[PDB]
Symmetry: D2
Subunit: 351 residues, 4 copies
């Protein structure tokens, strides 16, 4: 079997690996459409995961089931499915506590291109098919469906953790794919004023489409001061961190009102720590709560998000800017994510 | 001054009273636009409230401040304001416990036409102006603004008490003005499938506009069976009670699944009591939570909802079907809320 | 093997049955100590559950592991174990939604004596050993340990659902074993004044020991009037329903304050419906929330409650009033729960 | 009138002030018993809360009403009362939002020795008597009653914000007065294992009395490694920060499990920021929530805590180690808080 893998730190190329076997409760799937992610780039060129030798990359896909284990009861070869990027082991004490994302370990719910070969191969492995897969509606465009697996679930989780009320004012820092879904999520929770922060034109138009009432360019002046001008020195009720450096935490604390909430969905990968400004945090007594976490996965989450798309609660087509046709294009696509052209949001490869 | 009032149970009439005087923290306001509510019909022609002696009616209005006490600091004579139907006494133990709606007594937060002279007069009295009033936006249409004072705040409250999740299925029983706002609120909390119950043609079209994906007519058969057929026998996640008789409670319990929530915003003005079906309620162990409460009021609630309108999160114009001009039309308007002509939702009298 | 079973509605007797076999993830356990429950009396004599035939009874036990499947990793033959009355199927959609108690159906988390052969037999089956068992501490008395499997988990759950604030006034209707654990749980959540309702002397003493500050006898007149006089006409903050007929719901509604919460842990197995008094419920606008649910189970719940006992947070010995030695005493012990002698609370049979 | 005040940074001494006069809703009270706080030390000798001049210190007291405004209805001259350290302005928007502690500004609910003359004077002013005072029980020792005003409300708030589960493992960093009430509060919320961190002998014994199951000291090396050895390398469910430097946030993050909560009640007096270790915080994706807030106040809170003491839920006498007689001893008492003698916890001065 051939697939696109990380040969080592800073090196990637096509390799030959043996096709994975399926256990009694597993399923083997072949990709129909895939999409490169920002995290893939960070593991290869930044060593954000350690040293990996010959590991196939990727964690965002939709495909066809080609083989199932003896105990699989809800799926069979031929089924077209949506695969959530987070596929946890449902039999754990962490699950009994209410935290699927950390089943058997911190972030252990994230398997593809971490401690298991990714989806950028002729075939890939899915653990516990009945608990980690959802059926793909026949009339749903493949491009749009791939956006559910990670972008939609991550951004919407940001709005959920933020505990938004009807009429609350919100600020979203970073307007890339994840940030754009954070804006959409906030509107879908009843937010009044929504302020997006970014600079790339293509992202700015998308931000307004999803619900942004105000746009701020961080390169044109201290972002905190800009927020105060807009709110007449009052601040905002909630803040969502979706992009930028570790210093965005300090900015968030300075703009939120006493009693407000800060929600992080950005994976920080540089430096030794993040800092909380003491005075602005009311010396630790201003009731300014800080939250953050990996997107939830599994079958239920996938089906609920799918239905929202079916009932037109959100239009996912705006996130996809580049579409390719043919297995070999997986290479050209990942390269596109590395160079970050100004006209790019997300790219999908249809096999 | 003159004012339309309830002389006694089943008797209405115009009486001559002394113009109200404001205390140190109060304000006297003259109405600009008002609207009749079905709640007053219950209290008067069915004595659902009790026996009253010469009490002026009405609780939904937009007006102009005329006089203020020596201690009022944020409002002055000539200001245009939005008056919330619930005007709590903020200096009470109930407020300290977190329940403004019951300051100094069960339902006491709501004063107009409950036990205090209402808005259907040349002038009326508002307690604690600085804590219970909100400025009316310059470009905002009067008819629309009146819908915030009661309909919007009650409907959204139903969606808030329901604790809706992203992708949850919801059923709204009763599609009158209040129910329509319940549908709009549910969509704005992330609901997936939304099923509306009613029959009036004008109310049905409005329901779809606000977000309903399915419509059911209770006259065609038992609604529980209808819902089960639509959901292949699964039932729904949430239920909002916005209309009908006491028997609607039993229906909600039967259609909601284990662990779901039932939210009541309907004002039951008759009957000795409501029933909960033992078997369907899982003998009291199915985790089917039942909630119910009076709509929130005060300045903050008014400002937060106002801003949602300003940011186009919801279009209130679809609620106003009838508009009159001239103070004397008040009596005629209140009668319509009793007659209920098939093409009516809410009516406003612009003075 | 033999086991004490329900032959049919109003029928009890010992039967001969085949010893259960274990699957790859199961375990076969032999009982060391068991206890009878009032729920079994509702099932057998009240038929409040449906029809059953030759179903072994009992759901409260501690035992020894005899055999385990090939995939069981944390348990082996020879281990002493605490078995929760609720043993869910962790691989289900209800679990993904946060309601283990209803995995694969309403109340489906509770299997023993509900629809699966109970613990009153020479051996019994436990589904998913690693996920549904807990090790019994070396020096823990068998009689005390049994109280954890149901009484402790149910009573505490009533206090948990009540969302008690520090200093809240509480009324516990019914002072049997479940109500006694409800009083203890309420105290362990920060309650101030705790009023218990009952009559049996032995229970009255236990109520005081667990935290009750006031005791009221329901056979002395209108219980609501009694409560009002004690509270100078103010009412109480919370109410936990743990005993009595369906009319206790009306009483709870009348004595609870607007904005309060009513928590039901009483398994109602008689009648058609429970009544909610219209006027006292503020016509459905008093924010008087009503909850009710089955007790949680699984390995995590058992281990957590176990540790609470080990750290002396609660003394379970006061619940066990009768102790027998020998399998044959199961029949007599169960009958006691039907007739209820004046000096009984709970009984345990050690094999 | 005379009082003990802060002359300037690092300066303390008695001065003369005009006798405070009451407004319509206010009351003038003379102290009967008071106590010094570590907060006062951070303001005077650390210039934490900016620079103050001639401000009377103190915020913990019990006293007698000597004068009331024309509008006061529940309190009269001669009444003995309990005064909560937090006395919020109930007519504010923050109160409408559910945050009394920040009425009219960040931390503005706390007035005494923050920006208003404290209780260390012959007479002091209490805003809104009917909403901010509680009657002192006839037979309640003055020393005990003063511990309600701040220590009890603060420690218990740490437990409340921590959202403790029945059986949760908890670690309390800092075992002084506040940390002691933190341990007591956690037990009254159902905690199982409670590990305290401190070394002072008198505190170590009081900690065990309140509920601590394990005690750790810094001499043994890395506090994290110690916690890991005790927990088999698993960590704990919750962490309450009650004392120590800002580096304790880092320790809390490293010892808490993914999905846990960190609760801060420690008033951090110096430093630019608090540091969060990137890797241990799971790059901000491990769901480790961070909270922190000022203690609640007002009439309801005071009465509720008062009743918890009346019903013997907590014994406050263990906090008072030093008792002085005569107004003049305030200076000596306040100095002890700075010196920190090995046998001190709290000191009370009776007039
Ligand atoms: N006190 C306060 O501040 C306020 C309280 N409330 C209360 O909320 C409630 C809703 O008022 P409103 O919106 O004016 O209601 P309406 O009287 O206009 O009727 C609402 C709906 O109930 C339906 N309905 C009738 N019978 C049934 C049935 N048997 N089964 C299912 N549905 C049925 C409808 O059917 P159809 O289409 O046939 O008419 C109609 O769409 C009222 O009781 C009101 O007092 C609302 C606002 C304020
Ligand atoms: N399915 C499950 O897993 C379980 C369900 N449950 C359920 O919870 C409930 C409680 O069980 P248990 O504690 O064993 O009950 P008991 O049979 O011991 O009775 C408890 C109390 O109810 C009383 N009572 C009777 N009538 C009234 C009344 N009119 N008003 C007030 N109190 C009254 C008592 O009075 P007196 O003092 O005179 O007897 C007694 O104090 C039962 O339904 C049981 O099935 C409990 C455990 C498990
Ligand atoms: N592990 C998982 O399963 C996943 C984790 N995540 C994580 O969430 C995060 C967001 O990813 P993605 O949406 O692809 O983001 P992008 O890389 O496209 O960038 C988003 C934003 O960051 C910007 N930015 C840079 N500096 C600042 C600044 N100083 N202030 C404000 N904004 C700034 C933007 O400006 P400009 O317009 O100039 O670029 C841009 O709008 C990433 O860390 C990602 O790994 C996301 C998906 C999956
Ligand atoms: N503003 C308000 O209304 C109030 C604010 N607060 C605040 O809460 C916080 C606590 O006061 P309180 O508990 O009375 O204070 P204390 O000064 O008595 O000290 C408490 C603990 O801190 C210790 N300690 C020192 N360094 C460390 C460390 N590095 N790690 C762990 N523990 C350490 C202790 O050790 P040892 O045992 O060796 O002494 C002691 O047990 C203070 O900042 C205070 O201002 C409290 C009340 C009111
Ligand atoms: Zn991704
Ligand atoms: Zn109304
Ligand atoms: Zn039972
Ligand atoms: Zn203090």
């Amino acid at each position: 079997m051939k697939g696109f893998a990380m040969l080592g730190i800073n090196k990637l190329g096509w390799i030959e690996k043996e096709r994975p076997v399926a256990g009694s409760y597993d399923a083997i799937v072949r990709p129909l459409a895939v999409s490169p992610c920002t995290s893939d780039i960070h593991t290869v060129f930044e060593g954000a995961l350690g040293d990996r030798k010959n590991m196939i990359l990727g964690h965002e896909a939709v495909g066809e089931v080609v083989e199932v284990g003896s105990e699989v009861k809800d799926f069979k070869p031929g089924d077209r499915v949506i695969v959530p990027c987070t596929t946890p082991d449902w039999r754990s004490l962490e699950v009994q506590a209410g935290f699927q994302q950390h089943s058997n370990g911190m972030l252990a719910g994230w398997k593809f291109s971490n401690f298991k070969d990714g989806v950028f191969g002729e075939y890939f492995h899915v653990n516990d098919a009945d608990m980690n897969l959802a059926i793909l509606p026949k009339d749903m465009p493949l491009e749009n469906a791939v956006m559910i697996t990670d972008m939609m679930t991550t951004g919407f989780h940001g709005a959920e953790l933020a505990d938004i009320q009807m009429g609350s004012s919100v600020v979203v820092i970073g307007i890339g794919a994840v940030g754009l879904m954070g804006i959409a999520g906030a509107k879908l929770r009843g937010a009044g004023r929504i302020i997006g922060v970014g600079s790339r034109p293509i992202c700015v138009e998308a931000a307004k489409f999803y619900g942004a009432t105000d746009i701020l360019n961080y390169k044109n002046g201290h972002i905190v001061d800009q927020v105060m001008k807009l709110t007449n020195g009052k601040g905002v009720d909630r803040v969502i961190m979706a992009g930028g450096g570790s210093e965005t935490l300090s900015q968030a604390v300075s703009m939120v009102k006493p009693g407000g909430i800060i929600s992080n969905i950005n994976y920080h990968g540089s430096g030794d720590a993040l800092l909380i400004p003491r005075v602005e945090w009311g010396c630790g007594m201003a009731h300014k709560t800080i939250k953050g976490g990996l997107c939830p996965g599994g079958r239920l989450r996938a089906e609920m998000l799918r239905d929202m798309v079916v009932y037109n609660r959100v239009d996912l087509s705006k996130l996809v800017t580049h579409v390719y046709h043919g297995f070999d294009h997986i290479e050209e696509a990942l390269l596109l994510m590395k160079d970050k052209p100004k006209d790019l949001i997300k790219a999908v490869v249809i096999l």
